[PDB]
Structure 1
Amino acid sequence: HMIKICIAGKNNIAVNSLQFILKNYFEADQIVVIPNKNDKGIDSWQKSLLKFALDNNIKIVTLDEIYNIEQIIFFSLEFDQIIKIENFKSDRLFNIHFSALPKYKGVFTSITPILNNELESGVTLHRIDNGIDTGNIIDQHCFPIDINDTARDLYFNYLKYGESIFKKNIQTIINNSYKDLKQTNINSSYFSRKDINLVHKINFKKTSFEIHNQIRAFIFQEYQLPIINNSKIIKSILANEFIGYNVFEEFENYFIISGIDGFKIIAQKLN
């Protein structure tokens, strides 16, 4: 068919990966795009896929419009819809998921690995099957969650590494010469929206590492910041200085906190 590829989703990973295909592989007339339902068609703190496509004379389609395109490559890059694979003639359906699968299937993956005490995360390119982030893994890139990284910092890492893993593998996908491996049952985890209360209530009867992690997992200013006694927190810093157990002291610009193991946290208040 004339149309070779659909890019579906949002943000700079989608925009940049589309730019890369336009520059290196396919002409506009060979590409269609499905923006997310919330795409305003203007750039914000991320670029708009809708705007990029219109600016570049790529057609905006719906899923209904591509299901019958033989051999189309369908590529989800932060797409907001669950696919049903039997809708499609093509079986060339792919996603980049922002975690180190099989762990942290589902949502809010800039939050969940932090909240669960992980030292690393990853991006994973996989085939789409009918389950949520369950299909066979094509490629994965693991990277650290540094000790004072926030959810926002981690999200910007997913965008960066996600764009790179796209570029690394896209020719094998286009050539249908990639290899994949089924995901294991062990280590598989999943979160849905119901599992995370974005207005997090910190549990201080925890270690310093855990309290620190509770704070920084919710630091993502475009959405929210965690609040301690009515002040928003912009950064948490965990040190291995021992300051005594269960410290909590509020100052004008920051809190000094330690948990049951007495390591020092500085929780910096938003200016």
Structure 2
Amino acid sequence: MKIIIAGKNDIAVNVTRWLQKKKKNIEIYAICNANDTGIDTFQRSFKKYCKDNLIPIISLAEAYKIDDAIFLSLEFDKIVQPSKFNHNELFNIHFSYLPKYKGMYTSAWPILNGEDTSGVTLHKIDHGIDTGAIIAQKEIIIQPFETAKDLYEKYISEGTSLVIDNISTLLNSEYVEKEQNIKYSSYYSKKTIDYSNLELNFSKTAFEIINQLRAFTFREYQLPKLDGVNIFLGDVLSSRSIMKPGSILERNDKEIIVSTIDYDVVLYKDNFKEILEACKYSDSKYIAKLIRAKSILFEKNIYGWSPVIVAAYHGNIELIKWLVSKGANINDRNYKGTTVAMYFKDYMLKSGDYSGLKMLIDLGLDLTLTDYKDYTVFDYLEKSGNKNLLQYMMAFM
């Protein structure tokens, strides 16, 4: 009944928070990665979560001496001496389908290499990097429209789940170790991609080039650029410019068209900011005309505001309905964990118009959700003494 969670970001926090609610008797210790500066971004800080839940934050030296613990690495950044532990209960979540794509930038390389699938892998920590034996594995399908950001989010959801599904095997040490194949194993270092001098390579096929776009589309770090201008995805055209690859063929307000090894490509200029503004008040027929790629309906600005969030804070229900039919999350959250329902609560208070709630509820809105300060929409309504809207909302429970 002891566990050491060593790692970072949302998966570290999700697994930890699951444990606290569902196995309240377990003692939890944490180790944080070097560059966890204790501040939330588009990723939760695990250091911050741990300080706020009174989870003692230990070091690796101390971890070696805590004999009855299991040691769970959720993207931990430091090599560990597996034999130094007095037990063998040492696990790691790796964001790939091992033995492929060991190492770095696993939301990028599978896409770059034109993979259809990737995965998450729960394995033993061994003397190899990402090389210890497999315990549990999840194949993830990458969709042709999906970016690095989209795939990373799958890694988060699916890795969290993978841990939770297997948590008892781990806790009881009743799991089977199957050793990794050497065959088709791959590894990429941090040197494989220079994200500080990121340049698209057009001396490639059009298939490859779109796959670069997809792969490098991870807004919160960067977007790919063509001539100082951000791009959000692209498509293959039927034309084949004789121009040397890289040559810009046309240039207009919506796009750039380039010569590749084979088929020409359209790079769509990023209009995410325009779209998000429009979402305050535009109908879906107008918004649909603005979209050149589906994935952009689910992007977020620096606060974590998505199209569905903006639309909810402005009571733009007709648009919310459409967005959800395009696959948006009716319970989308910002980087404080603030839910769509919380944004709409604000619209309901500001407008006095409460009737739309049932519409959102029927779209899957969940009022029981808690933000990162652990407050529900009902809590906020009490703090602030808006008893009428509170009673109205309560009636749905």
Check whether TM > 0.5: yes
Q: Does 1:269 align with 2:270?
A: yes
Q: Tell whether the 8 Å contact from 1:258 to 1:265 is kept in structure 2 after alignment.
A: no
Aligned residues: 266
Q: Deviation digits for residues 116-155 of structure 1, max 9, x if unmatched? A: 1211111000000021100101111111221122211111
Shift of 1:183: 0.6
Which letter does structure 1 place at the counterpart of 2:146? D
Shift of 1:85: 0.9
Q: Tell whether the 8 Å contact from 2:97 to 2:139 is kept in structure 1 after alignment.
A: yes
Which letter does structure 2 place at the counterpart of 1:134? T
Whole-angstrom distance in 2 between the partners of 1:245 and 1:121 = 33
Whole-angstrom distance in 2 between the partners of 1:258 and 1:23 = 55
Q: Select which of 150, 162, 165 maps to 2:162.
A: 165
Instruction: Among all aligned residue pairs of Structure 1 and Structure 2, give the percentage whose two residues are the same amino acid.
Output: 45
Which letter does structure 1 place at the counterpart of 2:263? G
Q: Tell whether the 8 Å contact from 2:2 to 2:70 is kept in structure 1 after alignment.
A: yes
The TM-score, its normalising length taken from structure 1, stands at: 0.91
Q: Select which of 239, 242, 254 maps to 2:238.
A: 242
SS class of match (2:230): strand
Shift of 1:214: 1.5
Q: Tell whether the 8 Å contact from 2:33 to 2:76 is kept in structure 1 after alignment.
A: yes
1:226 aligned partner: 224
SS class of match (1:206): coil
2:82 aligned partner: 85
1:140 aligned partner: 137
Whole-angstrom distance in 1 between the partners of 2:186 and 2:144 = 22
Q: 1:227 to 1:265 in 2, by over 3 A?
A: same
Whole-angstrom distance in 1 between the partners of 2:268 and 2:190 = 26
Q: Deviation digits for residues 37-71 of structure 1, max 9, x if unmatched? A: 12222322121211221222211111111101113
Q: Tell whether the 8 Å contact from 1:71 to 1:92 is kept in structure 2 after alignment.
A: no
Which letter does structure 2 place at the counterpart of 1:262? Y
Q: Deviation digits for residues 60-95 of structure 1, max 9, x if unmatched? A: 111111101113100011111111112322211000
Shift of 1:110: 1.1
Deviating more after overlay: 198-207 vs 130-139: 198-207
Shift of 1:258: 5.7
SS class of match (1:59): coil
Runs of 5+ unmatched residues, structure 2: 243-247, 274-397
Deviating more after overlay: 152-161 vs 40-49: 40-49
Whole-angstrom distance in 1 between the partners of 2:31 and 2:198 = 33
Q: Tell whether the 8 Å contact from 1:212 to 1:265 is kept in structure 2 after alignment.
A: no
Q: Tell whether the 8 Å contact from 1:243 to 1:258 is kept in structure 2 after alignment.
A: no
Q: Select which of 15, 24, 30 maps to 2:13.
A: 15
Which letter does structure 1 place at the counterpart of 2:238? F
SS class of match (1:228): coil
Which letter does structure 2 place at the counterpart of 1:154? L
Whole-angstrom distance in 2 between the partners of 1:195 and 1:166 = 29
Q: Does 1:196 align with 2:193?
A: yes
1:216 aligned partner: 214
Whole-angstrom distance in 2 between the partners of 1:238 and 1:99 = 27
Q: Does 1:150 align with 2:147?
A: yes
Whole-angstrom distance in 1 between the partners of 2:235 and 2:157 = 25
Q: Select which of 60, 65, 82 maps to 1:63.
A: 60
The structure with higher relative contact order (CA 8 Å, sep 6+) is 1
Q: Tell whether the 8 Å contact from 2:255 to 2:266 is kept in structure 1 after alignment.
A: no
Q: 1:207 to 1:82 in 2, by over 3 A?
A: same
Shift of 1:202: 2.3
Which letter does structure 1 place at the counterpart of 2:129? I
Q: Identify, as 1 or 2, the structure richer in strand.
A: 1
1:121 aligned partner: 118
Shift of 1:26: 4.4
Q: Tell whether the 8 Å contact from 2:111 to 2:215 is kept in structure 1 after alignment.
A: yes
Larger radius of gyration: 2
Q: Tell whether the 8 Å contact from 1:208 to 1:265 is kept in structure 2 after alignment.
A: no
Shift of 1:180: 2.4
SS class of match (2:49): helix
The TM-score, its normalising length taken from structure 2, stands at: 0.63
Q: Identify, as 1 or 2, the structure richer in helix.
A: 2
Shift of 1:238: 3.1
Q: Tell whether the 8 Å contact from 2:97 to 2:120 is kept in structure 1 after alignment.
A: yes
Shift of 1:163: 0.7
